[PDB]
Design a protein around this ligand. Structure first.
Ligand SMILES: Nc1ncnc2c1ncn2[C@@H]1O[C@H](COP(=O)(O)OP(=O)(O)OP(=O)(O)O)[C@@H](O)[C@H]1O
Ligand SMILES: [K+]
Ligand SMILES: [K+]
Ligand SMILES: [K+]
Ligand SMILES: [Mg+2]
Ligand SMILES: [Mg+2]
Ligand SMILES: [Mg+2]
Ligand SMILES: [Mg+2]
Ligand SMILES: [Mg+2]
Ligand SMILES: [Mg+2]
Ligand SMILES: [Mg+2]
Ligand SMILES: [Mg+2]
Ligand SMILES: [Mg+2]
Ligand SMILES: [Mg+2]
Ligand SMILES: [Mg+2]
Ligand SMILES: [Mg+2]
Ligand SMILES: [Mg+2]
Ligand SMILES: [Mg+2]
Lengths: 97, 112, 174, 81, 35, 134, 156, 164, 105, 53, 118
RNA sequence: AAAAGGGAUCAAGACAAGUCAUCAUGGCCUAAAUAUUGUGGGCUAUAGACGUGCCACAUUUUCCUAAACAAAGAGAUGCAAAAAUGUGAAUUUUAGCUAAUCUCAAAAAAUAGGAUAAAAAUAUACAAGGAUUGUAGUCUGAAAUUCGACUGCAUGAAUAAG
């Protein structure tokens, strides 16, 4: 789960650009965003078998690849963390004051 | 034209078509038992073919007014034929205005 | 000439034939993660007949699991991949049935009964316990796993000369 | 009549068969829903298309069809000139 | 004796007895019911 | 029903009947704005058990004479009888003629009524006119 | 499945009875006593309540054998105006015994729950008060439902 | 108007007791139960139907097989649950004509049921027009009687030993 | 501990184990499943609707025997009567709230 | 289990006992027009006639 | 294998092969398999050589792709010769079954022709 | 029980907002016609283009099997049971009820099993989909051709989530 969220302020960065500012998100908003990513990866995989356990086993295999650190959501997490780290100075920006 | 009463008997809102739909309800009332014997002989597959063909030709010669499908309910206050309520013989509108004033018994504005 | 908008038009190895069907039918009769239950005893040739075992769980012999697995005794719906060693429960009906099957072969008699019940009441796995008591006592087990493969028109069939019967060669061979 | 069990739709027509060699004028009719019976195969009709009467010569291929199917009521829509 | 049909309408007696309960809750006056 | 000895049971509140109509507020294009109407029919049920047949008819006669405006009443009367209805309904012809001796004065007509024509047909079509058509 | 008309078609496009299949005609004989196994044995036929069509003939027969064994003078009988019966099925199930399975006793359920708990699949204190809660949620001891409530849950 | 109705209930209602007659239960010969509907001074086309319902076992002149043949002829008019044949008639313009017909139609059913020509013993009684209802009742074994209180304490004492 | 819902058992009436637990939750929260026999009769509603109704029913009945369990049942969620009810369809709306496509142009 | 010819003898005894049409072959006798009740008189009296003014 | 000139792959249902011929559907095909005792779920590879030849001789008599299109194309051609309203629609490539022509007549213009595919 | 919810209601004024085609009404026009009646036709036409809807593009879907749980409303201008017939629409024949009684009437998703896969792109493996059209029928009604709603058989278009 990412520890921050990005929300921009309409027209405060430059000539028609928004000032992106990172914000922290609570627990419920942290797990939700994480599990929604897992389903995204699952819905893009191809089908492997038949029966009722098709979707259930496609989600569980992603929950095992996340604990093993070999999942595609890890690249999706660190990608949002970089934006915050890069925009950590916008908190005290002069356009918000 | 031949079925239009020479003396007006309608007591409700009179109209060109209200006077024309009233002449059809009376012409069908007189020929309904006769028109139901031609539809029975046409559908009775036990009678000879010629018997059913003669009734089929005579039903086609009946005047249009005698046909029951020509009858269409009309508002007794406005004379329209579109959006008539069978329970009140009025349009959806005339029903509303009268219901609010209190002229239609029992009808009340519904909230729930 | 039409001038509306029209969307313009624009990966992995496929599974082998029969791979998908074999996925929703494989039976997992073991789970390493599960703990080895201490005191779990194995069955014996005359262990499904004793009534003092009613209400106790016993593990199936490893040699019987090779036979029950050969004639498709286990099923996907049944959950065996949750424990380590396939084990059954000696029910009060098992001892009721086994004693009849044990006395039938004793005097060459034949018992003919129809196991009946409501939804998941143990009906099938009681046949798996009747086959287990057969293998362990030197019997000949001829089992038809699914009776719907013979009537749903899914296997080859051919008639017999001068007879109303019909044979099923492909199924009889397998 | 659509349903076959109650015969076809027949309308009173002045279909009087003439003596051989006589000249009979075409039948003017507005009954555009009259099933073309076999008994008048070969007569000349003039079906009313709402405004005019279009001549028609019944043949053995029209038996069962309606007289109104051989006289268009509208005109073919043609863009431009 | 009695009719078999006259007996089939007597047995259908599952009526609830009038309880004559005692009110323990205070009751307000009713509204003004217009004509 | 108490003075007549008829044990009444009720009033039993029956399920009220609700009709509904949704009509546009305007007599024209403005259909996006409608409103709901209804006509709720409130009813009751008074059941009389072990009531004498004739006595019940007095109870019903008394209620029609003193009927309260705005109420529609419908009654179903149950009566027991022996076998051979044909005979019973024939023996009681003279008994009814004695009770109507002093009631024939209500109806009066000219000799050989010619406006009625077929009596049985007159009743049939004159009952439709009063009822309203059916 | 084998107590009804099969889904097969003969050359004249007429459904073949499930008892006409050679392999199914051999079992129905041993079940009805026609074929006498000399060396003895057992002929067991188990029903199923998942993906199986209803056959009044089979159900009626089972209900008839349970009544006769139970010492009842009023045994169920055919519905004279029902046309979903099969004479063949009655002859096969005319002299077969019946085994009616129901929920396991409270004692057996305990021995089956301690095995699920000793294996780490049931993290609960298995006592009488707890053996009665699974015995009640599972329709008075239905083993299959006792599994959906303790092993196939989303709490473990 | 409330006074006009209080004046009736204080002075005119008491006089209704001078013409009332006590109810007498029907004898063994009164086997029919006719029903007539009134609309209290209103013309409704449904005020001409006459319903009649009798029980076959009330006719003590018919035999066993004759009573069962009367139920097969009734058809859908027979209620197997209550064992009552109910039939109506609204064919004629007047109520008196609809009751006379049912008074004669029932005499033909009893005359046809006595016909020894065909007893219809081969035909089994058909009850497919009726839908039988199932009524569930509180189990009699769950009632907490004095004998069950002892049976429960013994079960609760056996559970403690097992755990202990 | 023998529960009968409308004549059938808990497993024959409710196919969803989620409903079986909520139906007898009062006995489960207070740990009295093996001390009471419940014979309920339900009418109307769906699967969960009836199960939740049985919850409040057994709760009130259980309090009659042991009125001191209300503080616990209060915290178990077996005393409140959920008044949530399907909203009505309103004229001009496709549903209680859903409105048709609003064309700006 | 009951022959069809033996069942029609009971269906025929009811038609005589109630005077109803007996059509075991489902022939189109057009009786559906005879059982249909007339609605003419109900339609004619739709518009209130001229009354005292 | 070969069935009346056309070649089919092994992993193809015989039921679906007989249904690929114009004029043959579920009813006709279902009656052809039963004639030669071929279970509906039989794939092409399993058919023996003898039975395959029988199917060819069985379809040779049926009214199939070319013999069936003729009947449909003759029915449509007769409507244009007589001069029926239904005939002109095929010639003009317009809806033939009383459909609102204000919008959504794409398939009509595309497929309605005197020389229909079938 | 309770931290309740929804409906109706929502002013004046403005938009010379809509309606003189509900009705009503002033002025101005038609009065052998701008009035009245019937037959048939049209309002259903179709290059291009704009609005709302339905539905589909298979792997949480669809298909097959089975012994669960609703509410509300309708039937005197009628709802129609159970039977018998047809693959089906439906027909034949009317038991009851004009109704908390009888009838429409059956809930579906769901729950639990089962079948199908290189489930469209390797052309001898063309998926799902149901448009278009041929043909034989049924129901309502003088009447189904322009121009109706359904049913059987065959035909099998676009459509890779925009
Ligand atoms: N005696 C037992 N010991 C252990 N597990 C059992 C026992 N009996 C039944 N089970 C389990 O119960 C579940 C269902 O059993 P089973 O598959 O035999 O049902 P069934 O009678 O065949 O039902 P159906 O009517 O659907 O065919 C399985 O998970 C099974 O392991
Ligand atoms: K809803
Ligand atoms: K305002
Ligand atoms: K304006
Ligand atoms: Mg099984
Ligand atoms: Mg468009
Ligand atoms: Mg307010
Ligand atoms: Mg505007
Ligand atoms: Mg004007
Ligand atoms: Mg239009
Ligand atoms: Mg589909
Ligand atoms: Mg029916
Ligand atoms: Mg309906
Ligand atoms: Mg499923
Ligand atoms: Mg795909
Ligand atoms: Mg396809
Ligand atoms: Mg058409
Ligand atoms: Mg989209």
């Amino acid at each position: 789960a990412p520890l921050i969220k990005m929300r921009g302020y309409k027209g405060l960065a430059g000539g028609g650009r928004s000032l992106e500012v990172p914000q922290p998100i609570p627990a419920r908003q942290r797990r939700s965003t994480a599990f929604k990513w897992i389903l995204d990866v699952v819905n893009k995989k191809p089908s492997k078998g038949s029966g009722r356990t098709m979707f259930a086993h496609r989600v569980a295999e992603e929950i095992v690849a996340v604990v093993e650190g070999r999942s595609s959501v890890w690249d999706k997490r660190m990608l949002i963390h970089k934006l915050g780290t890069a925009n950590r100075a916008n908190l005290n920006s002069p356009a918000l004051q | 034209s031949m079925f239009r009463a020479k003396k007006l008997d309608l007591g409700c809102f009179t109209n060109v078509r209200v006077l024309r739909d009233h002449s059809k309800r009376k012409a069908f009332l007189e020929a309904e038992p006769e028109r139901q014997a031609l539809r029975y002989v046409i559908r009775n597959t036990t009678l000879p073919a010629r018997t059913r063909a003669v009734a089929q030709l005579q039903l086609t010669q009946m005047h249009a007014y005698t046909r029951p499908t020509q009858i269409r309910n009309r508002c007794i206050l406005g004379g329209k034929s579109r959006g008539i309520l069978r329970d009140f013989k009025m349009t959806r509108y005339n029903f509303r205005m009268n219901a609010l004033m209190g002229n239609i018994p029992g009808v009340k504005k519904a909230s729930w | 000439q039409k001038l509306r908008f029209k969307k313009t038009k624009k990966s992995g190895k496929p599974p082998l034939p029969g791979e998908r069907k074999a996925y929703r039918k494989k039976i997992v009769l073991s789970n390493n993660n599960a703990l080895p239950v201490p005191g779990l005893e194995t069955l014996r040739p005359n262990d499904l007949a004793k009534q003092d075992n009613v209400g106790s769980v016993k593990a199936l012999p490893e040699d019987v699991v090779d036979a029950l697995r050969a004639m498709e005794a286990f099923k996907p719906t049944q959950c065996w991949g949750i424990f380590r060693q396939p084990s059954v429960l000696i029910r009060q009906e098992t001892v009721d049935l086994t004693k009849k099957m044990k006395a039938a072969g004793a005097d060459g008699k034949t018992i003919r009964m129809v196991i009946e019940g409501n939804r998941v009441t143990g009906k099938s796995l009681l046949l798996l316990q009747a086959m287990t008591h057969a293998f362990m006592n030197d019997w000949v087990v001829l089992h038809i796993p699914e009776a719907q493969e013979l009537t749903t028109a899914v296997t080859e069939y051919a008639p017999i000369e001068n007879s109303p019967l019909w044979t099923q060669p492909t199924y009889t061979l397998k | 009549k659509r349903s076959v069990w109650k015969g076809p739709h027949i309308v009173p027509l002045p279909i009087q068969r003439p003596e051989p060699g006589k000249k009979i004028a075409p039948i003017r009719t507005q009954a555009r829903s009259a099933t073309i019976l076999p008994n008048f195969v070969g007569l000349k009709f003039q079906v009313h298309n709402g405004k005019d009467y279009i001549d028609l010569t019944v043949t053995e291929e029209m038996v069962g069809h309606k007289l109104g199917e051989f006289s268009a009521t509208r005109k073919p829509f043609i863009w431009g000139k | 004796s009695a009719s078999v049909i006259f007996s089939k309408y007597i047995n259908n007696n599952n009526n609830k007895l009038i309880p004559f309960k005692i009110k323990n809750s205070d009751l307000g006056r009713t509204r003004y019911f217009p004509p | 029903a108490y003075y007549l000895g008829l044990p009444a049971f009720g009033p039993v509140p029956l399920p009220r009947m609700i009709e509904r109509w949704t009509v546009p507020k305007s007599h024209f294009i403005f259909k996006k704005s409608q409103e709901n109407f209804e006509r709720v029919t409130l009813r009751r049920l008074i059941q009389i058990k072990d009531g004498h047949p004739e006595t019940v008819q007095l109870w019903l006669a008394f209620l029609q004479k003193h009927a309260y405006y705005g109420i529609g009443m419908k009654a179903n009367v149950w009566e027991f009888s022996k076998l051979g209805v044909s005979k019973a309904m024939d023996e009681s012809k003279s008994e009814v003629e004695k009770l109507l001796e002093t009631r024939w004065e209500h109806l009066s007509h000219v000799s050989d009524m010619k406006g009625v024509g077929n009596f049985e047909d007159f009743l049939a079509k004159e009952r439709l006119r009063i009822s309203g058509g059916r | 499945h084998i107590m009804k008309v099969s889904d097969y078609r003969n050359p004249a496009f007429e459904l073949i009875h499930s008892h006409d299949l050679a392999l199914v005609k051999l079992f129905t004989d041993c079940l009805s006593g026609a074929t006498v196994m000399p060396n003895g044995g057992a002929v067991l036929g188990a029903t199923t309540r998942g993906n199986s069509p209803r056959s009044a003939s089979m159900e009626l027969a089972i209900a008839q054998r349970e009544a006769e064994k139970a010492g009842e003078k009023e045994v169920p009988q055919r519905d004279p105006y029902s046309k979903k019966y099969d004479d063949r099925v009655e002859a096969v199930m005319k002299s077969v015994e019946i085994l009616r399975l129901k929920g396991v006793s409270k004692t057996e359920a305990r021995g089956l729950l301690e095995y699920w708990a000793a294996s780490g699949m049931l993290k609960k204190r298995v006592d009488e008060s707890m053996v009665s809660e699974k015995w009640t949620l599972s329709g008075n001891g239905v083993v299959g439902e006792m599994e959906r409530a303790s092993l196939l849950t989303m709490k473990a | 108007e409330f006074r006009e109705y209080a004046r009736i209930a204080v002075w005119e209602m008491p006089l209704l007791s001078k013409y009332a007659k006590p109810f007498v239960p029907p004898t063994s010969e009164e086997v029919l139960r006719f029903r007539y509907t009134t609309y209290m001074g209103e013309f409704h086309p449904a005020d001409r139907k006459v319903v009649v319902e009798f029980c076959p076992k009330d006719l003590r002149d018919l035999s066993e097989v004759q009573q069962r043949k009367l139920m097969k002829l009734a058809g859908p008019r027979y209620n197997p649950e209550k064992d009552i044949i109910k039939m109506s008639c609204e064919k004629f313009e007047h109520q008196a004509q609809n009751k006379r017909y049912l008074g004669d139609l029932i005499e033909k059913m009893i005359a046809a049921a006595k016909d020894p020509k065909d007893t219809f013993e081969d035909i089994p009684l058909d009850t497919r027009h009726h839908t039988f209802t199932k009524k569930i009742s509180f189990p009699k074994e769950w009632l907490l009687t004095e004998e069950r209180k002892k049976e429960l304490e013994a079960a609760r004492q056996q559970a403690l030993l097992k755990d202990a | 501990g023998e529960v009968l819902v409308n004549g059938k058992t808990l497993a024959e009436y409710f196919g969803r184990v989620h409903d079986r637990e909520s139906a007898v939750w009062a006995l489960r929260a207070t740990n009295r499943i093996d001390k009471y026999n419940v014979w309920v009769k339900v009418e109307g509603g769906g699967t969960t609707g009836q199960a939740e109704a049985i919850t409040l029913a057994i709760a009130k009945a259980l309090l009659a025997h042991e009125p001191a369990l209300k503080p616990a049942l209060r915290r178990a969620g077996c005393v409140t009567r959920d008044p949530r009810k399907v909203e009505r369809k309103k004229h001009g709306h496709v549903k209680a709230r859903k409105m048709p496509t609003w064309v700006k142009r | 289990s009951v022959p069809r010819a033996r069942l029609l003898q009971l269906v025929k005894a009811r038609c005589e006992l109630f005077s109803t049409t007996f059509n075991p072959e489902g022939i189109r006798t057009g009786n559906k027009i005879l059982r249909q009740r007339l609605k003419g008189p109900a339609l004619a009296t739709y518009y209130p006639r001229k009354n005292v003014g | 294998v070969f069935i009346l000139g056309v070649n089919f792959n092994e992993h193809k249902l015989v039921q679906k092969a007989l249904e690929s011929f114009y004029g043959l559907g579920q009813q006709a095909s279902a009656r052809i398999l039963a004639k030669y005792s071929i279970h509906p779920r039989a794939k092409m590879g399993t058919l023996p050589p003898k039975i395959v030849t029988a199917l060819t001789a069985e379809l040779s008599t049926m009214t199939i792709e070319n013999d069936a299109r003729r009947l449909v194309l003759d029915n449509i051609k007769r409507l244009r010769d007589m001069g029926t309203y239904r005939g002109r629609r095929h010639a003009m490539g317009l809806p033939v079954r009383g459909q609102q022509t204000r919008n959504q007549i794409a398939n009509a213009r595309k497929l309605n022709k005197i020389e229909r595919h079938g």
